[PDB]
Structures are given as structure tokens and as C-alpha cells.
Design an enzyme around this catalytic site. Structure first.
Site, PDB file in Angstrom:
ATOM      1  N   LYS A  13       0.850  -1.176   0.000  1.00 18.38           N
ATOM      2  CA  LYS A  13       0.000   0.000   0.000  1.00 18.38           C
ATOM      3  C   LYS A  13       0.884   1.224   0.000  1.00 18.38           C
ATOM      4  CE  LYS A  13      -2.051  -0.999   3.782  1.00 18.38           C
ATOM      5  NZ  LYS A  13      -1.456  -2.261   4.184  1.00 18.38           N
ATOM      6  N   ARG A  88      -8.856   1.340   9.851  1.00 21.56           N
ATOM      7  CA  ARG A  88      -8.343   0.018  10.124  1.00 21.56           C
ATOM      8  C   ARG A  88      -9.439  -0.730  10.884  1.00 21.56           C
ATOM      9  NH1 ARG A  88      -2.576   0.129   9.470  1.00 21.56           N
ATOM     10  NH2 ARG A  88      -1.802  -1.953  10.075  1.00 21.56           N
ATOM     11  N   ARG A 123      11.893  -5.752   4.023  1.00 18.25           N
ATOM     12  CA  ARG A 123      11.495  -4.375   3.777  1.00 18.25           C
ATOM     13  C   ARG A 123      12.393  -3.457   4.604  1.00 18.25           C
ATOM     14  NH1 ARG A 123       5.488  -2.871   5.277  1.00 18.25           N
ATOM     15  NH2 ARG A 123       6.116  -3.831   7.260  1.00 18.25           N
ATOM     16  N   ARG A 156      12.107  -1.760  10.115  1.00 16.21           N
ATOM     17  CA  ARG A 156      11.106  -1.420  11.129  1.00 16.21           C
ATOM     18  C   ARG A 156      11.162  -2.331  12.342  1.00 16.21           C
ATOM     19  NH1 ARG A 156       5.456  -0.422   8.213  1.00 16.21           N
ATOM     20  NH2 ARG A 156       4.940  -1.612  10.112  1.00 16.21           N
ATOM     21  N   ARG A 167       0.086  -9.677  13.485  1.00 17.16           N
ATOM     22  CA  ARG A 167      -0.410  -8.580  12.645  1.00 17.16           C
ATOM     23  C   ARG A 167      -1.445  -9.067  11.641  1.00 17.16           C
ATOM     24  NH1 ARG A 167       4.354  -6.038  12.188  1.00 17.16           N
ATOM     25  NH2 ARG A 167       4.778  -5.305  10.075  1.00 17.16           N
TER      26      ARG A 167
END
Ligand code: ADP
Ligand code: AMP
Length: 214
Positions: A13, A88, A123, A156, A167
Site C-alpha cells: 500500500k 483500520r 522491507r 522497522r 499482525r
């Protein structure tokens, strides 16, 4: 033009958030980014988020709705914005309706659960700007450095297999229902719904989005 990105964690996203931003102008409002900034700059509105985030749990609706209400406030968001990571939850989505915050498009990024762990473990981000890379699938022009400022990239804190698992579930429990939510909105004419294949190559999803918008 207002837009909402809706998708599982690691669905790309944010990566797509950047593009639409630079190509259409509208600022990118990423709740998670704001949460991480605030948690780091020790801001008063956000610092609390720290433990929840690193646990994989969603932060309390009330805190986030506040931040968003505070950021939409800025004058840069008077011509449109991009909610990337919000809503969310139904409450969060509901809160936007009462506040009279309508969106023009809702884009559902479809991506399989099996693809997620591996996208996320590799990532890396440029925290200051939120620019997001992937060591294999969409790397930087120079290993370990942001493409625009040459600054060192980081991983992260919540980007680890385990936390990604926790998650995904919350995603399925709390966020997922929103697909149904906006489907209904789209049916009533309140918005435009659009699903896109998030497994495709970045450059390709980019063009699909460009087809959907303009
Ligand atoms: N379309 C894609 N195909 C393969 N990898 C992608 C794709 N889009 C994004 N990625 C990479 O996947 C990781 C997660 O995507 P990201 O854009 O951070 O999504 P989200 O914001 O939904 O978590 C990043 O490392 C990113 O560079
Ligand atoms: N809109 C939101 N509602 C609730 N929690 C959020 C929200 N956005 C971000 N968070 C928190 O931010 C963390 C990372 O989200 P993201 O960076 O968008 O993947 C999540 O693990 C949540 O704890």
C-alpha cells in the site's frame, strides 16, 4: 481527490502510496508513519503507541482518529489526501462518516497471506520520509541508501516473522470487515471501489492504478 488504500500488511500500500502522491499531488497520510514519528520524537499525541505497535496489536481507535483529524487539518490536505493505513476498523470508518470525510476511491490491494512474511522481512525504509524498499523485489539504486537523500535505510521494529503473524490475524479480525463496508458504500454510490492484484510487479500495479484513476 480523496483516496483510501485497503489491504493486508505488506500488500504494497505504502509503495503505491508514494507514486499516487508524486503523480497527483495529494499528501500521503500514513497513520503508522505518524505513530512511529511521534513515538520517536516523543510527541505527546502518539508516544503511547510504542508497546502496542511492537507487539503487533492495533492501537486504540481514539488515539488514531485524533491524529488523523489533526493532520487532515493541515492546509496541504485541502485539495485531497491519501489515507494509507486508515481506517483500520469499523469504528474508525464510522468516525470518518460522521465527521463528513468522504473518499472518492477505495482501493483494495489483493495479496495472499503466504506472500506476506517474505515481503515484510526484507522491507527497509527511509523513516524520515517513509520511503519504502525491498532488498529483493524493489531495492534501492544504492544498497542500503535512500534514493532521494542518500541517507542510511533501516528495518522497522515491528518487522519480524512473529509480529507479522500477530499482525495478520488482527487484520483478519478488525480490518478485513471494511472490504464489506466500502463495498456497500460503493453500491450506494457514495464511493468508487476497486480491487487490484498486489502480487504483480510494482511497475505493473502502478499502471493498473493509473488505469483506475487517470
Ligand atoms: N508489488 C510488489 N511486488 C513485490 N514486492 C512489493 C510489491 N509492492 C511492494 N513490495 C515490497 O514489499 C514490502 C511491503 O510493501 P509495502 O509497500 O510496505 O506495503 P504495505 O504498506 O501495504 O505494508 C516492501 O519491502 C516493498 O518494497
Ligand atoms: N489506523 C490504525 N489503527 C490502529 N492502529 C494502527 C493504525 N495505523 C497504524 N496502527 C498501528 O501502527 C502499526 C503499524 O502499521 P503500518 O505501519 O501501517 O503497518 C500497527 O501494528 C498498529 O499498531
Amino acid at each position: 481527490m480523496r483516496i483510501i488504500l485497503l489491504g493486508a500488511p505488506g500488500a504494497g500500500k505504502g509503495t503505491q502510496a508514494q507514486f499516487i502522491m508524486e503523480k497527483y499531488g495529494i499528501p500521503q497520510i500514513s497513520t503508522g508513519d505518524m505513530l512511529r514519528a511521534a513515538v520517536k520524537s516523543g510527541s505527546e499525541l502518539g508516544k503511547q503507541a510504542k508497546d502496542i505497535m511492537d507487539a503487533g496489536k492495533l492501537v486504540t481507535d481514539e488515539l488514531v482518529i485524533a491524529l488523523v483529524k489533526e493532520r487532515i487539518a493541515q492546509e496541504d490536505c485541502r485539495n485531497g489526501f491519501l489515507l494509507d493505513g486508515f481506517p483500520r476498523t469499523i469504528p474508525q470508518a464510522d468516525a470518518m462518516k460522521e465527521a463528513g470525510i468522504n473518499v472518492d476511491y477505495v482501493l483494495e490491494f489483493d495479496v495472499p497471506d503466504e506472500l506476506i512474511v517474505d515481503r515484510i522481512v526484507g522491507r527497509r525504509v527511509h523513516a524520515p520520509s517513509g520511503r519504502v524498499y525491498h532488498v529483493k523485489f524493489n531495492p534501492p539504486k544504492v544498497e542500503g541508501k535512500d534514493d532521494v537523500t542518500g541517507e542510511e535505510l533501516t528495518t522497522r521494529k515491528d518487522d519480524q516473522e512473529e509480529t507479522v503473524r500477530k499482525r495478520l490475524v488482527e487484520y483478519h479480525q478488525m480490518t478485513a470487515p471494511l472490504i464489506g463496508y466500502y463495498s456497500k458504500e460503493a453500491e450506494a454510490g457514495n464511493t468508487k471501489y476497486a480491487k487490484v492484484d498486489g502480487t504483480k510487479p510494482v511497475a505493473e500495479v502502478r499502471a493498473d492504478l493509473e488505469k483506475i484513476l487517470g
